[PDB]
Amino acid sequence: VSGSLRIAIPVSFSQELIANLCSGFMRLYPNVELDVQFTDNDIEGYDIAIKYGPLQSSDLVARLLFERQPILVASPGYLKTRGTPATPKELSDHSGILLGTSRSAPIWPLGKRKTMVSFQRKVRVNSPIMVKQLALDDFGIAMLSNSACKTELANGQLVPILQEWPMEPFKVYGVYSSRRQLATNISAFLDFFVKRFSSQESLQS
Amino acid sequence: DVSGSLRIAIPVSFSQELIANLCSGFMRLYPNVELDVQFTDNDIGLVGEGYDIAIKYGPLQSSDLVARLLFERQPILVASPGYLKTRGTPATPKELSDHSGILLGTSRSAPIWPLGKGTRKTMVSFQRKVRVNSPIMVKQLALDDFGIAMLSNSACKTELANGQLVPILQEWPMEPFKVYGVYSSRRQLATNISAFLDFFVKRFSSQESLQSLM
């Protein structure tokens, strides 16, 4: 396992988390050089693109890496001031904190009871760090990973709402070219990535 | 009146935690502003339906933009004691080409640092062990002994004071870097824009816990 590995990762991934992962990877494989770009471009000479599902027709070779379960939450202060929405249709009268890029719409798919609803777009940002802080700071309703916020849920700083209409889990994949189907550095990296996001101190985002 | 929407573009290398704290404070002061904040390294427009503000590192190179200096930092070259104990300490810039560097950069950034005794800087190359567009990852990898890194002496104050990072080549410093908020001249109505940029400086400069973030 050697050579160079150029990897694209959405801006919504935690840079702290990916840093810890790449450190452990390089410790195991000392002869690999890394070029990691946090970017929201739809992938430019990349060996691996990390992507959220669903995969597109251009994604001809891919590996499922992990899944996460989002949940809708707000702070108790927000719910005291604005009320607790009783059904998804009431989200239209509520402030939401949208995780998205410059063409992402303030629409959330809820239920399985399956429906798509809008909300007042108080903030749009492509940073989960900022989404979480703004939710804690009483600004409105946010979709957060149930694993990313277990402490805040346990201590009541975030409150789950509309639990009768759960969201579909999201899946994360690694996409790579069939030209590199035999590449040992790609396989080594994705194996290490899967082990971290499945059994580790890394299940925090 | 400060109200309506503000759209802000920010480099991917910029602290998301710092921006989150400042945006929370801004919206608590101005409850009628809706924010659209995008961390991006793409070229973005500053007119019409494009962005209202871009946060940009120096140098400024464009007329038709107005700029407000948000803060300035002094980068220094550092490595961990563990790195230096095994690879040796470079004595001159010429020796850096034999050393591992952790490069902060995007897809066209070269593995060079401009170093110089005085104002005149010269390109100094290193082995590109890592390139990444994240100061957080750069710092962690330097702390974990993977190579030499350019780091802000503010972001790394604690690690320098206690020895987990060690400055090198101190006789060939780098230029400071400067962080601006920029907006279009061809765009007037800068009530919300000026309110944001001046709140940024007022809150950043009075909160020590924020100054450590970059």
Residue numbers in the entry:
A (entry chain B): 90 to 132, 137 to 205, 208 to 300
B (entry chain A): 89 to 302
Paper text:
Here, we describe the discovery of a LysR type transcriptional regulator (LTTR), AccR (for ACCase regulator) in S. oneidensis, which directly and specifically activates transcription of the accS gene as a canonical LTTR. Like other LTTRs, AccR is predicted to form a N-terminal winged helix-turn-helix (wHTH) DNA-binding domain (DBD) and a C-terminal EBD (also called regulatory domain, RD) that are connected by a linker made of an extended helix and a flexible hinge. We showed that AccR interacts with the accS promoter in vivo in response to changes in acetyl-CoA levels and in vitro. Multiple lines of evidence indicate that acetyl-CoA is one of the effectors.
Despite numerous trials, we were not able to obtain any crystal hits for the full-length AccR. EBD crystals were rod-shaped, belonging to the space group C2. An EBD dimer was found in each asymmetric unit, with the two subunits arranged in an antiparallel manner. The final structural model of AccR EBD contains residues 89–302 for subunit A and residues 90–300 for the subunit B, except for residues 132–136 and 206–207 in two surface loops of the subunit B that are structurally disordered. In the AccR EBD dimer, ∼3200 Å2 of surface area is buried at the dimer interface, which is mostly mediated by α5, β4 with α7 and β10 from the adjacent subunit, suggesting stable molecular interactions. This funnel-shaped pocket, which runs through the entire molecule, is 25 Å by 20 Å wide near its opening, with most of the surface being neutral to positively charged. In addition, another ‘secondary’ pocket is found at the regulatory domain dimerization interface and contains S103 and E105 from both chains of the dimer. However, this secondary pocket found in AccR may not interact with acetyl-CoA because it is a negatively charged cavity as seen by the surface charge representation, and acetyl-CoA is also negatively charged.
